[PDB]
Amino acid sequence: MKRTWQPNRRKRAKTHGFRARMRTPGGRKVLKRRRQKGRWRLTPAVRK
Amino acid sequence: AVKKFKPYTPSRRFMTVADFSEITKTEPEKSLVKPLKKTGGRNNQGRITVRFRGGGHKRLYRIIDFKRWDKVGIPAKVAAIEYDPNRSARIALLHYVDGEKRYIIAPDGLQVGQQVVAGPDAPIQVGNALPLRFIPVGTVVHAVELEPKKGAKLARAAGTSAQIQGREGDYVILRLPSGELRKVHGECYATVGAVGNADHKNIVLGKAGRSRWLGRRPHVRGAAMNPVDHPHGGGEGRAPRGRPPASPWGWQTKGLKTRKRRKPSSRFIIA
RNA sequence: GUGGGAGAGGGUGGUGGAAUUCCCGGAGUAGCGGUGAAAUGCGCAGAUACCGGGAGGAACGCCGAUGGCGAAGGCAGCCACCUGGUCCACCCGUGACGCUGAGGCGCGAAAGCGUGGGGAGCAAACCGGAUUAGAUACCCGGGUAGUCCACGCCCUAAACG
RNA sequence: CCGAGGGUAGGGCCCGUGACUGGGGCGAAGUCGUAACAAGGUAGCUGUACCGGAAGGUGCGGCUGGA
RNA sequence: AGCCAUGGGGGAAUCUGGGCGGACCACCGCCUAAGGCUAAGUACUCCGGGUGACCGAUAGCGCACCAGUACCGUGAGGGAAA
RNA sequence: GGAGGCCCGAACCGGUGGGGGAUGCAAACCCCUCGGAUGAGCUGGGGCUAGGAGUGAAAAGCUAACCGAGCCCGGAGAUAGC
RNA sequence: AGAGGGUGAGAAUCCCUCUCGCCGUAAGCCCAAGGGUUCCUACGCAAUGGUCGUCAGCGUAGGGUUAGGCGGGACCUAAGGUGAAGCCGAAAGGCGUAGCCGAAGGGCAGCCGGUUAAUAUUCCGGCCCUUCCCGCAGGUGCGAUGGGGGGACGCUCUAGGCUAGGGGGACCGGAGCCAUGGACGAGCCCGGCCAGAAGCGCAGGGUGGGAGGUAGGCAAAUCCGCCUCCCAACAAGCUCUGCGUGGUGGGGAAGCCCGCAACCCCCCGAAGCCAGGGAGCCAAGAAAAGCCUCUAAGCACAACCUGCGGGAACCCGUACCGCAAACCGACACAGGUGGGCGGGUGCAAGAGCACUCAGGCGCGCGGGAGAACCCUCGCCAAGGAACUCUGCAAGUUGGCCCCGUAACUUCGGGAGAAGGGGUGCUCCCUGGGGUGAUGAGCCCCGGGGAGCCGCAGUGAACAGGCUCUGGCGACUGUUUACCAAAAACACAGCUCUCUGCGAACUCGUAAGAGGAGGUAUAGGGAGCGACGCUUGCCCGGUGCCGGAAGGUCAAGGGGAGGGGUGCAAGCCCCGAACCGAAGCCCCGGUGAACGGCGGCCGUAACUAUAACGGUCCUAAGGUAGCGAAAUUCCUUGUCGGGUAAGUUCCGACCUGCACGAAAAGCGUAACGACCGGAGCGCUGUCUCGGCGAGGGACCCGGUGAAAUUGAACUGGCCGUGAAGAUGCGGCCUACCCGUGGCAGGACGAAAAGACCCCGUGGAGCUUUACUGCAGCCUGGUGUUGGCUCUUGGUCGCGCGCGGCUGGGGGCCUAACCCUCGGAUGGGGGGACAGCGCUUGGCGGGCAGUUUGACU
RNA sequence: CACCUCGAUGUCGGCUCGUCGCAUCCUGGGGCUGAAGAAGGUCCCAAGGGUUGGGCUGUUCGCCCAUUAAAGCGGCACGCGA
Ligand SMILES: CC[C@H]1OC(=O)[C@H](C)C(=O)[C@H](C)[C@@H](O[C@@H]2O[C@H](C)C[C@H](N(C)C)[C@H]2O)[C@](C)(OC)C[C@@H](C)C(=O)[C@H](C)[C@H]2N(CCCCn3cnc(-c4cccnc4)c3)C(=O)O[C@]12C
Ligand SMILES: [K+]
Ligand SMILES: [Mg+2]
Ligand SMILES: [Mg+2]
Ligand SMILES: [Mg+2]
Ligand SMILES: [Mg+2]
Ligand SMILES: [Mg+2]
Ligand SMILES: [Mg+2]
Ligand SMILES: [Mg+2]
Ligand SMILES: [Mg+2]
Ligand SMILES: [Mg+2]
Ligand SMILES: [Mg+2]
Ligand SMILES: [Mg+2]
Ligand SMILES: [Mg+2]
Ligand SMILES: [Mg+2]
Ligand SMILES: [Mg+2]
Ligand SMILES: [Mg+2]
Ligand SMILES: [Mg+2]
Ligand SMILES: [Mg+2]
Ligand SMILES: [Mg+2]
Ligand SMILES: [Mg+2]
Ligand SMILES: [Mg+2]
Ligand SMILES: [Mg+2]
Ligand SMILES: [Mg+2]
Ligand SMILES: [Mg+2]
Ligand SMILES: [Mg+2]
Ligand SMILES: [Mg+2]
Ligand SMILES: [Mg+2]
Ligand SMILES: [Mg+2]
Ligand SMILES: [Mg+2]
Ligand SMILES: [Mg+2]
Ligand SMILES: [Mg+2]
Ligand SMILES: [Mg+2]
Ligand SMILES: [Mg+2]
Ligand SMILES: [Mg+2]
Ligand SMILES: [Mg+2]
Ligand SMILES: [Mg+2]
Ligand SMILES: [Mg+2]
Ligand SMILES: [Mg+2]
Ligand SMILES: [Mg+2]
Ligand SMILES: [Mg+2]
Ligand SMILES: [Mg+2]
Ligand SMILES: [Mg+2]
Ligand SMILES: [Mg+2]
Ligand SMILES: [Mg+2]
Ligand SMILES: [Mg+2]
Ligand SMILES: [Mg+2]
Ligand SMILES: [Mg+2]
Ligand SMILES: [Mg+2]
Ligand SMILES: [Mg+2]
Ligand SMILES: [Mg+2]
Ligand SMILES: [Mg+2]
Ligand SMILES: [Mg+2]
Ligand SMILES: [Mg+2]
Ligand SMILES: [Mg+2]
Ligand SMILES: [Mg+2]
Ligand SMILES: [Mg+2]
Ligand SMILES: [Mg+2]
Ligand SMILES: [Mg+2]
Ligand SMILES: [Mg+2]
Ligand SMILES: [Mg+2]
Ligand SMILES: [Mg+2]
Ligand SMILES: [Mg+2]
Ligand SMILES: [Mg+2]
Ligand SMILES: [Mg+2]
Ligand SMILES: [Mg+2]
Ligand SMILES: [Mg+2]
Ligand SMILES: [Mg+2]
Ligand SMILES: [Mg+2]
Ligand SMILES: [Mg+2]
Ligand SMILES: [Mg+2]
Ligand SMILES: [Mg+2]
Ligand SMILES: [Mg+2]
Ligand SMILES: [Mg+2]
Ligand SMILES: [Mg+2]
Ligand SMILES: [Mg+2]
Ligand SMILES: [Mg+2]
Ligand SMILES: [Mg+2]
Ligand SMILES: [Mg+2]
Ligand SMILES: [Mg+2]
Ligand SMILES: [Mg+2]
Ligand SMILES: [Mg+2]
Ligand SMILES: [Mg+2]
Ligand SMILES: [Mg+2]
Ligand SMILES: [Mg+2]
Ligand SMILES: [Mg+2]
Ligand SMILES: [Mg+2]
Ligand SMILES: [Mg+2]
Ligand SMILES: [Mg+2]
Ligand SMILES: [Mg+2]
Ligand SMILES: [Mg+2]
Ligand SMILES: [Mg+2]
Ligand SMILES: [Mg+2]
Ligand SMILES: [Mg+2]
Ligand SMILES: [Mg+2]
Ligand SMILES: [Mg+2]
Ligand SMILES: [Mg+2]
Ligand SMILES: [Mg+2]
Ligand SMILES: [Mg+2]
Ligand SMILES: [Mg+2]
Ligand SMILES: [Mg+2]
Ligand SMILES: [Mg+2]
Ligand SMILES: [Mg+2]
Ligand SMILES: [Mg+2]
Ligand SMILES: [Mg+2]
Ligand SMILES: [Mg+2]
Ligand SMILES: [Mg+2]
Ligand SMILES: [Mg+2]
Ligand SMILES: [Mg+2]
Ligand SMILES: [Mg+2]
Ligand SMILES: [Mg+2]
Ligand SMILES: [Mg+2]
Ligand SMILES: [Mg+2]
Ligand SMILES: [Mg+2]
Ligand SMILES: [Mg+2]
Ligand SMILES: [Mg+2]
Ligand SMILES: [Mg+2]
Ligand SMILES: [Mg+2]
Ligand SMILES: [Mg+2]
Ligand SMILES: [Mg+2]
Ligand SMILES: [Mg+2]
Ligand SMILES: [Mg+2]
Ligand SMILES: [Mg+2]
Ligand SMILES: [Mg+2]
Ligand SMILES: [Mg+2]
Ligand SMILES: [Mg+2]
Ligand SMILES: [Mg+2]
Ligand SMILES: [Mg+2]
Ligand SMILES: [Mg+2]
Ligand SMILES: [Mg+2]
Ligand SMILES: [Mg+2]
Ligand SMILES: [Mg+2]
Ligand SMILES: [Mg+2]
Ligand SMILES: [Mg+2]
Ligand SMILES: [Mg+2]
Ligand SMILES: [Mg+2]
Ligand SMILES: [Mg+2]
Ligand SMILES: [Mg+2]
Ligand SMILES: [Mg+2]
Ligand SMILES: [Mg+2]
Ligand SMILES: [Mg+2]
Ligand SMILES: [Mg+2]
Ligand SMILES: [Mg+2]
Ligand SMILES: [Mg+2]
Ligand SMILES: [Mg+2]
Ligand SMILES: [Mg+2]
Ligand SMILES: [Mg+2]
Ligand SMILES: [Mg+2]
Ligand SMILES: [Mg+2]
Ligand SMILES: [Mg+2]
Ligand SMILES: [Mg+2]
Ligand SMILES: [Mg+2]
Ligand SMILES: [Mg+2]
Ligand SMILES: [Mg+2]
Ligand SMILES: [Mg+2]
Ligand SMILES: [Mg+2]
Ligand SMILES: [Mg+2]
Ligand SMILES: [Mg+2]
Ligand SMILES: [Mg+2]
Ligand SMILES: [Mg+2]
Ligand SMILES: [Mg+2]
Ligand SMILES: [Mg+2]
Ligand SMILES: [Mg+2]
Ligand SMILES: [Mg+2]
Ligand SMILES: [Mg+2]
């Protein structure tokens, strides 16, 4: 049945996007964190 | 009039629909002067702030003329009476001699191919707009400005009217359809006559859709929810409020007056 | 047929004054109201009474009759329009074309009903006050439908000469 | 083939009858009140409506078979 | 319940000023608000080094190893093992 | 003539009863059977609304497979007379 | 599924062939999304593959994706997002005009074929376009981001032509085939097309043309719009699509030794095309650019326009999967996933159903048995609901055509009522329809006769059991994703209520917004919940509404009087009258506001009863209508009906434990996968079981889990023991080990019991618990201003002039606030509102908590 | 009463399968009888076997229907839901 993952690249970038992160000072801090944690990906990877 | 239907289906057996008698052989609406895209949207910025709105046939917004003095002493011919989907009234689309066309909301009595005109020099006849000053006491009038130059704002619902009840020099006294007695300024343009399509009140929706078509989503009885939801609600096995009838938000809803007192409107209203 | 007449006959629209009620102001004070007597009620939160103004609805006083009109129910300010009946005259026309009338159709007071509007006065219901053995009544103070309007029903009557 | 009739199904009318129920009639001397007939002690009757232990009351219009 | 501060209201003077010394007043005394700057001595440790009655691969940092990885989560985020 | 929250019935949406499944094919399935099926229909895509908040034809339903207050991280080694 | 042949160390599992089965609105084909190399090919088989594995979606490697025209982007706008200007917020940041971004929407140029192992509307081929730049003849007032038109729109129904597609053909073309009894045939088998500019035709869409006036589209227009008249007018024309044809270019089967080059006729025919077509209807149905036209500034040595030439024409995607082994579901997971195509025959139709093309599959373990048992399935004597909570289940019924159908009803319905009959095939005669053309084939509806066969003709698949009767609900709807689909919610409709518009209300600190580009016929809130008939009485309490008195009442005002300190004036404190809001008290109204709607006596010229009376209490004592009820305890009340028998059901009675009127009362046609009751039909439900089928179970080969598990060498009975013993005692019994079975025990497993209690645990919820807060109310005061009218208390002093202040009445405008074709302004409100501080109040809307112990 | 079991001993009734007790409902033996007979009563001995089909209700029970030799009563975690 309709499960919880309904992959949509637009939605994905639109939502967890890097630009998306940088608009909200929340998001900014997210990035801040993952950087300081040395995450390899600051943002959900999606490409097209 | 109003069309009843035979009951070839339940709901159809009760559902009266409007008498489209005096809808100028027209249908589609004069673009230009009207219409704009009409932004449907049941909430605001974010959140629902008026429940049970939503869906309901799409509408072009016929942009009507609610101040008539742009066109003082410029007669116009009543080009047509057309259905306007965003009102109980019916719009009259007039062709101005001037070239310009606008729709006024259409008073009872109005007819395709008739001169109407705005201004203090205006004959006192169906459809002509005039600042109240110049309207004979005790005449029925609609589309009334409230303050001057601010737009018609009163009686404009359908068979809505207002009576000029007399004057206070720089003012004038309207019986608003409310039955309210209010001082309104002389300068305020009302337009002669009553709103017409007065038959609107008498239509029976019928089926529970239709209501839906009107963008009116199903309303749910506070009592029928739970205490989280509503003052009524819970305590269940059916239930009687538990007093006293209230809104979702708490304020009493049987008879609790709500207009604020110190509202400058006053010495302007009476009953 | 020509010419005239009387008429609350019918329908629509408009309009006038009186009066009741309420509302605002002025003034003014110890009761008003009501009855057989009262009490309820109303009134120093200023009523009744008086003056002015305003809103609204219904009925149209005098004329008014023991009168008029309609087939009946029934119809009463005034105005306008629309319209029915009806009587007189002149003896012109048609030339019996008449009468009644099961059925049908129409109309049909009041109350009642549906949907809207309206609502001042009156007022079933109902509420009190008296009275009374009681008083689900008569009398008193309130007062809802209703009474009015539009349309649709109902179709009854001491619809009585 | 038609056919007595038998069968199945479904209707129509009629009679009987049924817990219980509605009123109606009659019943020498029952209870409650008194409505009506005399201004019947609130004129009466009335169609209607509403109401009430009951007669009945009241509203509305109506008749006089009342003043 | 002063002192310092100050959202509101009222509202001075310029040293015969004016704040303070724990309500207040009086003496006595202290100090000069409503402008601003000012190193040093202080804090921390991403980073370099030094040292350890610190660990020694289930310890020690989550990671000694190609770890914030694999993997998990839509995401924030979680997070190994070797 | 061709109206309808009209009828029967596929798609499509559903989820009534029963059986099966029950370390399943499946953390909601399968079969048979049933509801709706021009509508308050179903649906793709693009959007908006969120935690005492949303959304809710109302079940305290749903809000990323457990919602009478989501999840993550933090306060945090909460507190636990157990 | 079978076999044969390959391959290979090794093949049930790879390759090939033949045979078999399955799908065929797919289980085939295309597209989107997602996935991201999974594509192709060569080598491979450790692992992945539920077995195998030579194979693979796996490993290593190499190769493959080619665009002006397809899709996106150098176009447009939608919601929304963003955001100059502007507004607001402690900071973060929230808003917000324009604009900008934003698409599956609008706009725009490519069709057919051929080529690769893998790409192709891209490469090639043929034909045919598009836009930008330059250039020349000849032609026009040229010129926007502005103006206008256009774009540009719903739903249902639908015409006319086409096309796609499909069906025949005796015709054209063909390799061929004559089996097995017959057939050398107007035999059988295959195929008889695609694309194509301009011109044509045919169909259809769009479109009056003038002329003059113009106060409008923000004085730019000859454009548009609005007036006016010689013509013209159910048209022609003019453009624009579609479809034919079309120079020409392609394709081109069944078939064998292993490769010969038709192409037409008839019919059916779309939901697709023409397309902005038509009609009807209400719920009234995007925007913007492209496009056209208009004029501006500028400019006319331009510039457009029209051609014709020549140049120029980027970025990105393009394999492959794509209903699934490549996407979402940890899996090669029976689930989930949008769009398009989806052939043929037959069944009334169809996308249903069976079979079948094209195409694709046989589902990545097999082989055997042929037990129990389970699953799914078939049949059954006699019976026919006796099963059972219950006809649960299953059966029966079943399509179409004809006949025929009741109560009741809202009149549509109830109806598919019910309940029958028909149903194939052959031959004969005959009526109309479409296409042709009026003959003809060709499909298409029929009717009428005879006649054949069978157990049976919707011969298979798809396919209602029916009726009566209550309860709840009007009805279609909605719902507890994952135990409830309901009588719950919703619902049209009814009532109450708030709200006059900067509405009330909601969200927000605010700005801003929703409300609503609405305006009382409207919007909010509440309850009721079609419709019918109705909805009584009681305002003592609570709520709400009204009430310029009174009572109480905070800050503040006021200062009698009292005090602290000073030699002092002074400086400080308290501090009475007294004026001082809302709120409460108080008065009154209010029931579709919260709510409430009694008790005890007595009474009939028989008794049984109580219409009547009496009395207590009440705020008033339950009206109508229901009534052992979705309510009735007693209770299976009692009668009646139904049954052989009826705690149910149905109809009645009412002493209604404990109905009752919009938390509506009582009814109601229709509706209902709702819950009762009954009947017929029919049945494996049952008496009562039997047989049979297949998937398992069993056996062999392959692969190989699981929770659980103190260790075990784990018997019965009496006892005993923490009170239910393999484990103690006594006795009995018992060779050791399995396999298939069954479930009594191991207080078996599972989840540190949900019940219960406990904890000075937690949460959700309520309120007239506490205490706050938001919110609203409110006095004072700041913002806050002007001119008059009018009455006060205070000390002088002489009830009259002077202090000092205030209150109320108006008025104004200029703050503030709202608005108005753009504003140094006008109009409206107006010192009020708003907002700041401060006063009190209301305040489950919200929050934090409390809500004892013994027992 | 609160003794095992609240880190679970599933709770009524039904069906299925029984098995035990006997305080026996039948059937078999008996005594007394207010036992003439045949019927009963009552008590004693004795489960070996047997102990029906329905209606109603979830019921157990019970009331009913129709029978019968009788329509027994209990226990078994009110036996029996791995
Ligand atoms: C096995 C499947 C379930 O069966 C039962 O539910 C079984 C009937 C029981 O309920 C079981 C007997 C209970 O135990 C009893 O608890 C009692 C409180 C006491 C009893 N005593 C023994 C103590 C004890 O035994 C209990 C609690 O199970 C609830 C045991 C406990 C372990 C469970 O709850 C248990 C985990 C259940 N559960 C989810 C709950 C079910 C939700 N669900 C339902 N259907 C689905 C579903 C369906 C289809 C598809 N997907 C999901 C999901 C499971 O996934 O396993 C279950 C056992
Ligand atoms: K326990
Ligand atoms: Mg997941
Ligand atoms: Mg996308
Ligand atoms: Mg999305
Ligand atoms: Mg926004
Ligand atoms: Mg936002
Ligand atoms: Mg009002
Ligand atoms: Mg509702
Ligand atoms: Mg609820
Ligand atoms: Mg909530
Ligand atoms: Mg409340
Ligand atoms: Mg609440
Ligand atoms: Mg209840
Ligand atoms: Mg409640
Ligand atoms: Mg007065
Ligand atoms: Mg003559
Ligand atoms: Mg006559
Ligand atoms: Mg009348
Ligand atoms: Mg009426
Ligand atoms: Mg009276
Ligand atoms: Mg009448
Ligand atoms: Mg008379
Ligand atoms: Mg017969
Ligand atoms: Mg009398
Ligand atoms: Mg009398
Ligand atoms: Mg009398
Ligand atoms: Mg009467
Ligand atoms: Mg009376
Ligand atoms: Mg200081
Ligand atoms: Mg100081
Ligand atoms: Mg000191
Ligand atoms: Mg410094
Ligand atoms: Mg260091
Ligand atoms: Mg170091
Ligand atoms: Mg480590
Ligand atoms: Mg080691
Ligand atoms: Mg570690
Ligand atoms: Mg991830
Ligand atoms: Mg007709
Ligand atoms: Mg339908
Ligand atoms: Mg249906
Ligand atoms: Mg199901
Ligand atoms: Mg269910
Ligand atoms: Mg099951
Ligand atoms: Mg179905
Ligand atoms: Mg259907
Ligand atoms: Mg719709
Ligand atoms: Mg959608
Ligand atoms: Mg969830
Ligand atoms: Mg939680
Ligand atoms: Mg929360
Ligand atoms: Mg919580
Ligand atoms: Mg802490
Ligand atoms: Mg097919
Ligand atoms: Mg892709
Ligand atoms: Mg790879
Ligand atoms: Mg290979
Ligand atoms: Mg391998
Ligand atoms: Mg393997
Ligand atoms: Mg491959
Ligand atoms: Mg590979
Ligand atoms: Mg762009
Ligand atoms: Mg743009
Ligand atoms: Mg926008
Ligand atoms: Mg923003
Ligand atoms: Mg696009
Ligand atoms: Mg597009
Ligand atoms: Mg393109
Ligand atoms: Mg390919
Ligand atoms: Mg090419
Ligand atoms: Mg010029
Ligand atoms: Mg434009
Ligand atoms: Mg040939
Ligand atoms: Mg032969
Ligand atoms: Mg052919
Ligand atoms: Mg073709
Ligand atoms: Mg013209
Ligand atoms: Mg200009
Ligand atoms: Mg001109
Ligand atoms: Mg062609
Ligand atoms: Mg052509
Ligand atoms: Mg044709
Ligand atoms: Mg643009
Ligand atoms: Mg110039
Ligand atoms: Mg490609
Ligand atoms: Mg491809
Ligand atoms: Mg598909
Ligand atoms: Mg597989
Ligand atoms: Mg799958
Ligand atoms: Mg998968
Ligand atoms: Mg699908
Ligand atoms: Mg066919
Ligand atoms: Mg068929
Ligand atoms: Mg099929
Ligand atoms: Mg095949
Ligand atoms: Mg049988
Ligand atoms: Mg048989
Ligand atoms: Mg039978
Ligand atoms: Mg039975
Ligand atoms: Mg039985
Ligand atoms: Mg069944
Ligand atoms: Mg036959
Ligand atoms: Mg045959
Ligand atoms: Mg079959
Ligand atoms: Mg039923
Ligand atoms: Mg329902
Ligand atoms: Mg009802
Ligand atoms: Mg659902
Ligand atoms: Mg559920
Ligand atoms: Mg349902
Ligand atoms: Mg708006
Ligand atoms: Mg309302
Ligand atoms: Mg309800
Ligand atoms: Mg109800
Ligand atoms: Mg009161
Ligand atoms: Mg009361
Ligand atoms: Mg009260
Ligand atoms: Mg008050
Ligand atoms: Mg004070
Ligand atoms: Mg006060
Ligand atoms: Mg009531
Ligand atoms: Mg009563
Ligand atoms: Mg009863
Ligand atoms: Mg009973
Ligand atoms: Mg009860
Ligand atoms: Mg009987
Ligand atoms: Mg009985
Ligand atoms: Mg039963
Ligand atoms: Mg009954
Ligand atoms: Mg009730
Ligand atoms: Mg009530
Ligand atoms: Mg009822
Ligand atoms: Mg009913
Ligand atoms: Mg339904
Ligand atoms: Mg249902
Ligand atoms: Mg069986
Ligand atoms: Mg068997
Ligand atoms: Mg078998
Ligand atoms: Mg094996
Ligand atoms: Mg042993
Ligand atoms: Mg023992
Ligand atoms: Mg032992
Ligand atoms: Mg031992
Ligand atoms: Mg065994
Ligand atoms: Mg066992
Ligand atoms: Mg077993
Ligand atoms: Mg256990
Ligand atoms: Mg525990
Ligand atoms: Mg609380
Ligand atoms: Mg605390
Ligand atoms: Mg305790
Ligand atoms: Mg105790
Ligand atoms: Mg214990
Ligand atoms: Mg003890
Ligand atoms: Mg245990
Ligand atoms: Mg036993
Ligand atoms: Mg014995
Ligand atoms: Mg014996
Ligand atoms: Mg004996
Ligand atoms: Mg026995
Ligand atoms: Mg039975
Ligand atoms: Mg038991
Ligand atoms: Mg069980
Ligand atoms: Mg067990």
JSON list of C-alpha atoms (C1' of nucleotides) and ligand atoms in Angstrom, two decimals, chain G residues 748-750, chain H residues 5-9, ligand 156:
[
{"chain": "G", "resi": 748, "resn": "G", "atom": "C1'", "xyz": [3.67, -24.46, 28.20]},
{"chain": "G", "resi": 749, "resn": "A", "atom": "C1'", "xyz": [5.33, -19.38, 24.62]},
{"chain": "G", "resi": 750, "resn": "A", "atom": "C1'", "xyz": [4.56, -14.48, 23.81]},
{"chain": "H", "resi": 5, "resn": "U", "atom": "C1'", "xyz": [0.22, -17.49, 41.05]},
{"chain": "H", "resi": 6, "resn": "C", "atom": "C1'", "xyz": [-0.48, -9.57, 39.15]},
{"chain": "H", "resi": 7, "resn": "G", "atom": "C1'", "xyz": [8.30, -10.21, 34.86]},
{"chain": "H", "resi": 8, "resn": "A", "atom": "C1'", "xyz": [-0.24, -13.09, 33.04]},
{"chain": "H", "resi": 9, "resn": "U", "atom": "C1'", "xyz": [-2.80, -19.52, 36.20]},
{"chain": "I", "resi": 156, "resn": "MG", "atom": "MG", "xyz": [6.55, -16.98, 34.41]}
]
